[PDB]
Amino acid sequence: DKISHKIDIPDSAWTIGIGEKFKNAGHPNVKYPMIDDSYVQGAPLGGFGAGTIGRTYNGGFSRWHLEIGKNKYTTVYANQFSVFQKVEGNKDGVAQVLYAGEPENGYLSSWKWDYPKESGMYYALYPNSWYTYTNKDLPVQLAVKQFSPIIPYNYKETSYPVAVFKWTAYNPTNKNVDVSIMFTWQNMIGFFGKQVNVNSGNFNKIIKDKSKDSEIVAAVMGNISNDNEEWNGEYSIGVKKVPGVDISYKAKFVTTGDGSDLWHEFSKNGILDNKDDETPTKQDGIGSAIAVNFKLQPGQTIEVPFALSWDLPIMKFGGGDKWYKMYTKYFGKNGKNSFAILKEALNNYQKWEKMIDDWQKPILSNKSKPDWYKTALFNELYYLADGGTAWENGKVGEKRTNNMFGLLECFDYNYYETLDVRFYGSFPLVMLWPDIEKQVMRQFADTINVQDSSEFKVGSNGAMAVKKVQGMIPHDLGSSYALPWIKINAYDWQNPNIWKDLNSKYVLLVYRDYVLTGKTDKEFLKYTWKSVKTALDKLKEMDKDNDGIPDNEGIPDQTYATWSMKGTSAYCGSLWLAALKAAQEIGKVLKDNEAYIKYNEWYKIAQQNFEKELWNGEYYNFDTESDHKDSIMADQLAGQWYADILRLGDILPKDHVQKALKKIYEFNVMKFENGKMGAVNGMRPDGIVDESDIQAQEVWTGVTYALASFMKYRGMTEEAYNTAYGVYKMTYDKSGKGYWFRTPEAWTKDGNYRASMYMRPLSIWSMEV
Numbered sequence: 219d220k221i222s223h224k225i226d227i228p229d230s231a232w233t234i235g236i237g238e239k240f241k242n243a244g245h246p247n248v249k250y251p252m253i254d255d256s257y258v259q260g261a262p263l264g265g266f267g268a269g270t271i272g273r274t275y276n277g278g279f280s281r282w283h284l285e286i287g288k289n290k291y292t293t294v295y296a297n298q299f300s301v302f303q304k305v306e307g308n309k310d311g312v313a314q315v316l317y318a319g320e321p322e323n324g325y326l327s328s329w330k331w332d333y334p335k336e337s338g339m340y341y342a343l344y345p346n347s348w349y350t351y352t353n354k355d356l357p358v359q360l361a362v363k364q365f366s367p368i369i370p371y372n373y374k375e376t377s378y379p380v381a382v383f384k385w386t387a388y389n390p391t392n393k394n395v396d397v398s399i400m401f402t403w404q405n406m407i408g409f410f411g412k413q414v415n416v417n418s419g420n421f422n423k424i425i426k427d428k429s430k431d432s433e434i435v436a437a438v439m440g441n442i443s444n445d446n447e448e449w450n451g452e453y454s455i456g457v458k459k460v461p462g463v464d465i466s467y468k469a470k471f472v473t474t475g476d477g478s479d480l481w482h483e484f485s486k487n488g489i490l491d492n493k494d495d496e497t498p499t500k501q502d503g504i505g506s507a508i509a510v511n512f513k514l515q516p517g518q519t520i521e522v523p524f525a526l527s528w529d530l531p532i533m534k535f536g537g538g539d540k541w542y543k544m545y546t547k548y549f550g551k552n553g554k555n556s557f558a559i560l561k562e563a564l565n566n567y568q569k570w571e572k573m574i575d576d577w578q579k580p581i582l583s584n585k586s587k588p589d590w591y592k593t594a595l596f597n598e599l600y601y602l603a604d605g606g607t608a609w610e611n612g613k614v615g616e617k618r619t620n621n622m623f624g625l626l627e628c629f630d631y632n633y634y635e636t637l638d639v640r641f642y643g644s645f646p647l648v649m650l651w652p653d654i655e656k657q658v659m660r661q662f663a664d665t666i667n668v669q670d671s672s673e674f675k676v677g678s679n680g681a682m683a684v685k686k687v688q689g690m691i692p693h694d695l696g697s698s699y700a701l702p703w704i705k706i707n708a709y710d711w712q713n714p715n716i717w718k719d720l721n722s723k724y725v726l727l728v729y730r731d732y733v734l735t736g737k738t739d740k741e742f743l744k745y746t747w748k749s750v751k752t753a754l755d756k757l758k759e760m761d762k763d764n765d766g767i768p769d770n771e772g773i774p775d776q777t778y779a780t781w782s783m784k785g786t787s788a789y790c791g792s793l794w795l796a797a798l799k800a801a802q803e804i805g806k807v808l809k810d811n812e813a814y815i816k817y818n819e820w821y822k823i824a825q826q827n828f829e830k831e832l833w834n835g836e837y838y839n840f841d842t843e844s845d846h847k848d849s850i851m852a853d854q855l856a857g858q859w860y861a862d863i864l865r866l867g868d869i870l871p872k873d874h875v876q877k878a879l880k881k882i883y884e885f886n887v888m889k890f891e892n893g894k895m896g897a898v899n900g901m902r903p904d905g906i907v908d909e910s911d912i913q914a915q916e917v918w919t920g921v922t923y924a925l926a927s928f929m930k931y932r933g934m935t936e937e938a939y940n941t942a943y944g945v946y947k948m949t950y951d952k953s954g955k956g957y958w959f960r961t962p963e964a965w966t967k968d969g970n971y972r973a974s975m976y977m978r979p980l981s982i983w984s985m986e987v
């Protein structure tokens with residue numbers, strides 16, 4: 219490996235061999251159907267709201283999230299980088315597709331498939347990933363750095379449906395070597411959104427742009443139709459000329475054929491025919507090819523950038539709503555702008571690299587923190603772009619002030635912005651993209667007083683219930699199968715209108731967003747104040763025994779639905795105490811003196827009764843009235859965790875918080891599979907896992923990373939990182955269960971999972987507060 223020294227891969231990058239097999243991969247632990255796309259995954263490409271493309275460590279473009287809110291795992295075999303190499307003076311060279319695999323059927327059979335094992339590595343530190351190619355039969359060694367410009371405090375480039383592929387080639391041998399690199403791409407218009415004649419009208423054309431300082435050559439793959447539908451638009455691939463390379467191209471080859479129309483050209487001398495056949499197709503899949511060829515002298519290095527753009531301006535949801543994607547603000551809405559996006563990328567990618575380096579550097583250069591933590595911290599961010607992210611720039615047919623946003627809970631549980639989950643999972647947004655975070659929270663503020671009196675069938679039991687109650691925060695803001703932002707509370711397995719934790723978490727989130735953006739945004743507090751008071755006032759009504767705290771009802775009425783709570787619980791109780799103190803503070807800031815007095819009085823009463831009812835001398839009991847009431851809950855002090863972040867001080871005694879945390883570490887962590895798998899949710903004081911419900915026996919990834927941050931705030935540094943380590947190990951390490959770039963909600967003791975590709979573990983960013 220002589221190429222690794224020529225490029226700059228951080229030591230914290232997650233790593234795996236190209237073509238490596240993995241023996242210990244987990245699978246779903248539930249009986250109902252659930253996504254399992256295997257461990258062949260990689261860092262996604264594409265901005266927020268653009269639709270994402272998952273290119274795997276084997277090199278294939280395989281995890282497609284271009285249809286917003288859907289996960290489609292299939293390798294489009296025509297989408298590849300390929301290499302040609304011939305030592306100067308030799309009769310023949312070699313051509314090889316850079317993909318550790320081959321097609322299932324007979325299409326593209328003439329191409330050289332099956333990139334061999336132990337001949338390269340994949341690296342990932344999101345938003346960057348890398349492939350190196352160190353192959354006995356390729357004298358020139360190659361590496362590519364691939365990324366999308368995902369940049370904190372940047373709401374423009376971060377939206378772009380674009381990827382850059384910066385290739386570096388180096389000749390360690392004592393002879394001249396001719397090298398070509400070819401990017402192939404299928405015209406994917408009609409890949410989704412067309413019921414019949416999926417390729418019909420598709421056509422490809424070559425664009426050349428030569429404006430003195432920059433020569434760019436591109437293929438634009440679109441359709442003859444000018445219909446404004448979610449299926450229509452353009453894909454583009456291209457390259458920028460550098461000194462000492464030449465560009466060749468082929469606008470049209472057939473993806474539904476043996477591939478020899480392209481390969482007989484490329485495998486001969488690495489130079490394509492330069493034909494621009496713009497003729498539309500009927501039934502055949504078609505594609506485009508862009509190649510660069512150059513001669514490398516001994517010890518010479520060269521750098522050449524390729525790019526990929528996709529202008530698919532319209533997203534459609536199952537209920538019929540069509541919206542424009544965010545990036546259309548900067549490039550237009552007519553779906554004929556793929557080249558413009560590509561060009562911007564090819565002329566600005568160096569600036570984007572240094573912008574990405576600037577926001578990774580403070581963490582990467584802090585040598586007090588171990589590399590494994592940085593691996594998780596950065597790579598967990600995959601989910602912001604990959605989580606079916608919806609970011610609208612107008613409804614199709616309708617200007618606008620605000621641009622609504624939605625990130626999914628996950629793909630299995632297809633709900634936008636599930637509030638109880640985002641309580642943990644929204645840390646990256648508040649810390650790095652706060653305007654998005656504030657917009658999401660204003661969306662929630664606007665739903666508080668919505669009333670929908672029509673009834674729905676509750677799934678868990680069968681009972682009927684009202685859809686949306688006035689003054690109760692919704693579970694979610696809809697589903698991609700229905701109408702995001704318009705039809706809220708898509709979740710129906712329980713009744714969220716009786717939950718005792720959503721209203722509190724809502725309040726805590728509002729105050730969080732004020733505090734972590736510098737305590738300067740009074741206007742955000744004013745926008746949300748009515749909703750905050752309403753939310754706490756309705757929750758106070760659920761105090762049935764008059765201890766000042768809402769009663770859990772021994773039925774599904776919080777996040778841990780099936781692991782029931784009854785009476786005063788540590789979880790809902792602590793969240794309530796923290797929320798009341800939060801509302802106190804907003805009262806002071808806004809000079810709402812009566813609110814302050816009221817929430818102060820409610821707080822003191824509730825605080826005293828919480829302590830008296832739940833403190834047992836070592837920890838806080840799970841609740842007052844359950845069968846499993848003395849179980850040790852990992853999340854028992856969620857309220858105090860948020861209070862630390864919100865700088866609200868001690869809601870419970872320091873000494874008692876410390877003991878409770880030491881108990882959780884000693885029990886839920888250390889006595890669960892030797893602390894190598896995170897914190898199991900519930901442990902009985904005899905040191906045996908609480909078996910009363912499946913959720914109690916689960917490790918929740920995001921709860922565990924949140925728990926770790928809480929320990930870190932309280933000076934338990936060793937305990938924090940040891941707790942987090944088990945989650946890192948399970949996700950990323952060769953000894954874990956192969957969940958890289960699909961971190962699940964949960965696992966049980968056997969390492970098998972529930973709900974891959976989950977929002978909650980983004981809570982790791984709470985460790986950076």
Ligand SMILES: OC[C@H]1O[C@@H](O[C@@H]2[C@@H](O)[C@H](O)O[C@H](CO)[C@H]2O)[C@H](O)[C@@H](O)[C@@H]1O
Nearest residue numbers: 627631632633636638639709711777963
């Ligand atoms: O894992 C906790 C989260 O669970 C989600 O609830 C449901 C599943 O637990 C259940 O098995 O199936 C339905 C199918 O739609 C899921 O919604 C909730 O959405 C989350 O609020 C909860 O935190």
Ligand SMILES: [Ca+2]
Nearest residue numbers: 761767768769
């Ligand atoms: Ca009560």
